[PDB]
């Protein structure tokens, strides 16, 4: 054999059709909106609000490159220097390197551009290089330099413990990402910062370093985006929401029953999870190595939907009780392979419907698992509860009734780069989803035996009417009986065999 098991996928809930009616979009104390809501119309470019640039340069907002406070000790205006640097014609990759370093002189002997030079000179055909330097690069300069007329409203930092949303236009995101490419964001570079030390990288300089054979594929993927958004302005909106919860379940006491499961070894979250809450297997610094050498699940998703990358501008490192929810990002590329075999394949025409706020009906949640370096570490109760609460915060929507919640589209979260056990993490996600009253659609990414094993456990537990609490207590017993007093790397028997025996024996 079977390709999928459990509840047919046609029976699972999907957006927009399962959705609450959206309230009117408006700015408020916990929702920043950077466009004119009164003028938002389908197929029209949104108008920035306010009409003229307003600057804040403080510890609660993004420091914009176009700020009059963005100065260089010669005090000269760094925005003026940026403009003079980028409005030269490029015909050779050294021209672009020298331009970026004019306003980054402190890094002129630290940043490496080898991958940019190789991409331009040694990967691209002559016609492709000419298209890059005659069309794509100068169009990117012009949208970057229009920043003060496009991003007129200060952008607040989504700082630790904030429950806050920012809704901005795709056009505004494109201007900001072109600045990131040209490495213009101030105060976001020094390795010995206090300021932004708790925020991810945003400037793209690590994309230009070294000789990995995957750098040209990352660059192709990004230039597909940049070519598209500079050739024709995108018309929709994107919302970024930080969610930080205070109250978590007492898991042992939870009387909720398990919800429905569809599990399959074919397909992916991004192709087969249309209208479902899509999980991003995050680093606590959202996007992880997307701007450097990373190229597994999250990093690939951030390349093919590049509007995700701008979350790194304003999103502080996630604490154990937090997630980031992004609604409306558009898919611009397709890919083949994975990690060391990843290739850009072609431009993607996103056919997702838009909602009443002109957002693509695509909802992604970044939740970072723990990175385990010893197998048995993950069965410690404190660490199981940490994973349960993280997944719960990712899945829960306070205020929303369960019949208006789509299924979760997820898979082997924390079980590749982060070293977790997929049979344990799958059960953890099933318990968290049950506590949030959502069904689960689980992609095992080619592993047919894991598909069979998750299905078998789920239907065993469901047919015996075990609650979330009953299951969580079984996990505590596995730790006590097989892990705590263990003094070899691996326990004597595996989680699922333990569970079947414990239940069938009683």
Tally: H helices and E strands in the chain: 16, 14
Strands 237-244 and 164-169, by their bridges, are antiparallel
Going by the DSSP 8-state scheme, the letter that residue 7 receives in this structure is S
Sign of CA dihedral 412, 415, 420, 421: positive
Q: How far apart are the first and last CA of the chain?
A: 33
Distances in Å between the alpha carbon of 215 and those of 208, 292, 301? 8, 9, 16
DSSP 481: I
Tell me how far CA of residue 169 lies from CA of 174, 176, 238, 348, 402, in angstroms: 9, 11, 6, 20, 30
Token pair 């349960």 is found at 388
Residue 185: CB atoms within 10 A of its CB come to 20
**Two structure tokens written together for 8:** 């047919």
Q: How far apart are the C-alpha atoms of 421 and 495, rounded to whole Å?
A: 10
Contact of 281 with 290, CB cutoff 8 Å: no
Element (H, E) at 263: strand 261-264
Burial of 83 per CB tally in 10 Å (0-12, 13-18, 19+): middle
Could you give the CA distance from residue 472 to residue 468 in angstroms, rounded to a whole number? 6
Token pair of 81 as six digits: 């220097």
Distance CA 75, CA 206 (A): 28
- DSSP class of 278: E
The residues that bridge with 244 in the sheet, in sequence order, are 322
Angle, CA of 382, 241 and 280, to the nearest 5°: 60
Please check whether residue 97 is in contact with residue 112, taking contact to mean a CB–CB distance below 8 angstroms: no
At 315, give phi and psi (nearest 5°): -100, 110
Resolution given for this structure, in angstroms: 2.0
Q: Which of 494, 443, 439 is nearest to 5 (CA)?
A: 443
Torsion on CA atoms 130, 136, 141, 143, rounded to nearest 10: 160
CB 312 within 8 A of CB 199: yes
Residue (of 350, 356, 302, 294) closest to 324 by Cα position: 302
- The set of residues, in sequence order, having a beta carbon less than 8 Å from that of 168 and lying 6+ positions away, is 33, 34, 35, 151, 155, 237, 238, 240
The CA–CA distances, whole Å, from 141 to 32, 82, 94, 230, 290 equal: 27, 10, 16, 10, 22
SS3 456: helix
The experimental technique used to determine this model is X-ray
Could you tell me the two tokens for 258?
A: 């398990």
Q: Are the CB atoms for 64 and 55 separated by under 8 Å?
A: yes
**CA–CA separation, 306 and 149 (whole Å):** 22
* Tally of domains in the chain: 1
Question: Which parts of 252-371 fold into alpha helices (H)?
Answer: 269-272, 297-304, 311-314
C-alpha distance from residue 151 to each of 134, 234, 239, 307 (Å): 26, 15, 15, 15
C-alpha 202/C-alpha 309 separation (Å) is 8
Angle at CA 86, nearest 5°, toward 83 and 91?
Answer: 160
Q: Where in the sequence is the domain holding 32, given as residue range(s)?
A: 1-506
Of 368, 396, 32, the closest CA to residue 243 belongs to: 396
**With contact defined as beta carbons under 8 Å apart, do 237 and 328 qualify?**
yes
Is there a contact between 75 and 265 (Cβ–Cβ < 8 Å)? no
**Given 3-state DSSP classes, what are the helix, strand and coil percentages for the chain, each rounded to the nearest 5?**
40, 15, 45
Task: Report in angstroms the alpha-carbon separations of 68 from 59, 63, 79.
Answer: 16, 10, 8
Please list, in sequence order, all residues whose beta carbon lies within 8 angstroms of the beta carbon of residue 128, skipping any fewer than 6 positions away.
none
DSSP labels, 111-150: ---HHHHHIIIIIS-HHHHHHIIIIIHHHHHHHHHTHHHH
Query: Residue with structure tokens 């239940």?
Result: 503
What is the edge-to-edge ordering of all strands in the sheet holding 237-244? 4-6, 261-264, 440-443, 408-411, 277-282, 363-368, 322-327, 237-244, 164-169, 31-33
């Amino acid at each position: 054999d079977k390709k999928w098991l459990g509840t047919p996928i046609e029976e699972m809930r999907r957006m927009p059709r399962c959705g609450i009616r959206l309230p009117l979009l408006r700015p408020s104390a916990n929702h920043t909106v950077t466009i004119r809501v009164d003028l938002l119309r389908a197929g029209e470019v949104p108008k920035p609000f306010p009409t003229h640039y307003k600057d804040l340069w403080d510890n609660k907002h993004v420091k914009m490159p176009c700020s009059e406070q963005n100065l260089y000790p010669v005090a000269g205006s760094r925005w003026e220097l940026i403009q003079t640097a980028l409005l030269n014609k490029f015909t050779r990759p050294q021209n672009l390197k020298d331009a970026i370093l004019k306003y980054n002189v402190a890094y002129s002997k630290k940043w490496d551009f080898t991958a940019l030079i190789d991409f331009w000179d040694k990967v691209l055909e002559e016609a492709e290089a000419q298209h890059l330097y005659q069309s794509i690069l100068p169009d990117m300069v012009k949208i970057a330099l229009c920043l003060p007329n496009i991003c007129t409203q200060p952008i607040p930092l989504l700082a630790a413990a904030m429950n806050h949303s920012i809704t901005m236009s795709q056009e505004q995101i494109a201007s900001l990402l072109a600045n990131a490419f040209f490495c213009t964001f101030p105060r976001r570079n020094a390795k010995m910062k206090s300021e932004y030390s708790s925020y991810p990288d945003i400037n793209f300089n690590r994309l230009f370093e070294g000789r990995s054979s995957r750098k040209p594929e990352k660059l192709k993927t990004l230039f597909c985006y940049f070519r598209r958004v500079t050739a024709a302005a995108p018309t929709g909106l994107v919302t970024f929401t930080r969610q930080s919860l205070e109250d978590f379940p007492e898991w042992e006491r939870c009387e909720k029953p398990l919800t429905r499961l569809h599990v399959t070894y074919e397909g992916t979250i991004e192709e087969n999870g249309q209208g479902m809450l899509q999980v991003d297997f995050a680093n606590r610094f959202v996007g992880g190595g997307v701007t450097s050498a990373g190229l597994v699940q999250e990093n690939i998703r951030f390349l093919i939907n590049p509007e995700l990358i701008i979350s790194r501008l304003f999103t502080e490192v996630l604490d154990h009780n937090e997630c980031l929810i992004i609604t409306g990002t558009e898919q611009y590329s397709e890919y083949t392979g994975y990690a060391e075999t990843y290739r850009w394949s072609r431009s993607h025409e996103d056919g997702s419907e838009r909602d009443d706020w002109q957002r693509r009906c695509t909802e992604i949640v970044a939740i970072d698992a723990l990175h385990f370096r010893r197998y048995l570490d993950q069965f410690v109760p404190e660490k199981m509860r940490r994973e349960l609460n993280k997944a719960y915060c990712g899945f829960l929507r306070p205020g929303v009734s369960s019949e208006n919640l789509s299924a979760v589209a997820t898979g082997n979260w924390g079980c590749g780069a982060f070293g977790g056990d997929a049979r344990l993490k799958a059960l953890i996600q099933i318990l968290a989803a049950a506590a949030a009253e959502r069904d689960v659609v689980y992609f095992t990414f080619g592993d047919s035996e894991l598909m069979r094993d998750i299905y078998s456990m789920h239907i065993f537990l469901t047919e015996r009417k075990l609650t979330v609490g009953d299951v969580y207590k079984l996990l505590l017993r596995y730790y006590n009986e097989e892990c705590r007093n263990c003094s070899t790397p691996g326990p004597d028997i595996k989680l699922y065999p333990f569970i079947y025996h414990a239940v069938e024996s009683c």
